[PDB]
Amino acid sequence: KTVIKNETGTISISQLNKNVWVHTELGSAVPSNGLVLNTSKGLVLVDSSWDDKLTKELIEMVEKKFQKRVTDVIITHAHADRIGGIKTLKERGIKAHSTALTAELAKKNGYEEPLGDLQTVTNLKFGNMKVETFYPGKGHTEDNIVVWLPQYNILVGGCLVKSTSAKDLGNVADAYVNEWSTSIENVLKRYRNINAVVPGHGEVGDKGLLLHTLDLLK
Ligand SMILES: [Zn+2]
Ligand SMILES: [Zn+2]
Structure with missing residues (x-):
């Protein structure tokens, strides 16, 4: 796997396969991940x-x-690590897709609002790149969604999903610990053959990360 950093070393992108890279940035010293989809109609970020x-x-x-x-x-939800750059996106005319709930929660947190255009299950397509967004229920937050690439069986778990190195759930101020297991199970039930899972923070893994997150919920 290839890895390209920026001049300061605050940002890396690292390849999962041909058209799918992870992005990772550091804020105040805490890393955060998303995806980069290289499609024939432009770049799409998760x-x-x-x-x-x-x-x-x-x-x-x-x-x-x-x-x-x-x-x-x-x-994928209305916390700073996900939505922090929303002003940059809107001013550049980059479309910021989200559920309606994430948009409200954005406004409530005083962020500019994303589109609120995603339903519980939305199938999108950019060039040849298919993308499904799924709201599995409450967990890390009320609104947290996952992103699925059916052509690659790749799941972006976001902050719903913990990395192997995580010993606890992190900040549960906005969490629903009792719904979070059911929500993980809903992901397991929909996506029964998974090649890789991208957690919101920490290293990429497989479905073990969902089971690991289940264990941390006990
Ligand atoms: Zn969060
Ligand atoms: Zn997070």
Whole structure:
């Protein structure tokens, strides 16, 4: 797997396969992941980053490297690590897709609002790249969604899903610990053959990360 950093070393992208890279940025010293989809109609991100600066840097980095424009982003919940760069997106005319609940929660947290255009299950298509978004229920937050690439059997778990190295659930101020297991099970039931899982924070793994998150919920 290839890994490209930015000049400061605050941002990395690292390849999962041909058209699918993870993005990782550091904010205040805490890492955060999303996806970069290289499609024939432009670059699509799953999630932005912690703030406007890092989001700008992210976009600059992937636009140069893949030689096409970021056209769309999928926002997976309304916390800073996911939605922090929303102003950069809107001012560039980058479409910020989300559920209606994530948009409200964005506004309530005082962020500019994403589109609120995703339903519980939405099937999108960008160039040849298929993408499903799924709301499995409450967990890390009320609104948290996952993203599924059916052509690659790749799941972006976001902050719903913990990495192997995580010993606890992290910040549960906005969580629903009792719904979180059922929500993970809903993911397991929909996506019965998974090649890789991208957690919101920490290293990429397989379905074990969902089972691991279950254990941490006990
Ligand atoms: Zn969060
Ligand atoms: Zn997070």
